[PDB]
């Protein structure tokens, strides 16, 4: 639940960094 969605939060900051570069 909440732990998964927090992992998700940080992991879309990773996603946004990658998408920016691409």
């Amino acid at each position, epitope marked *: 639940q*909440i*732990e998964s969605t*927090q*992992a998700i939060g*940080q*992991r879309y900051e990773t996603i946004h960094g990658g998408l920016d570069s691409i």
Partner: nanobody
Amino acid sequence: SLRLSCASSRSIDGINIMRWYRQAPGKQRGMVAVVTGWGSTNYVDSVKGRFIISRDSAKDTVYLQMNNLKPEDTAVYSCNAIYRGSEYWGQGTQVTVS
């Protein structure tokens, strides 16, 4: 002299794996020193002698104090913990020369 530390915020002494990280710029991540609630003490292969972990339960903080000046330790840092196994992360700090 020579100086370093971090701090913490929320619900102290849930201090399970509460670990430091370090990133020399343009490199991958990296974990340096690990300390938990049970007085554990273990480090990265490079900071024995170079460093120390401390744990002040009072003001919701964990300490890590640099020793043995050598510039390469210059990097962007972080100092996180684990709670229900959730990825936790912060911002960091830098280190120097001479």
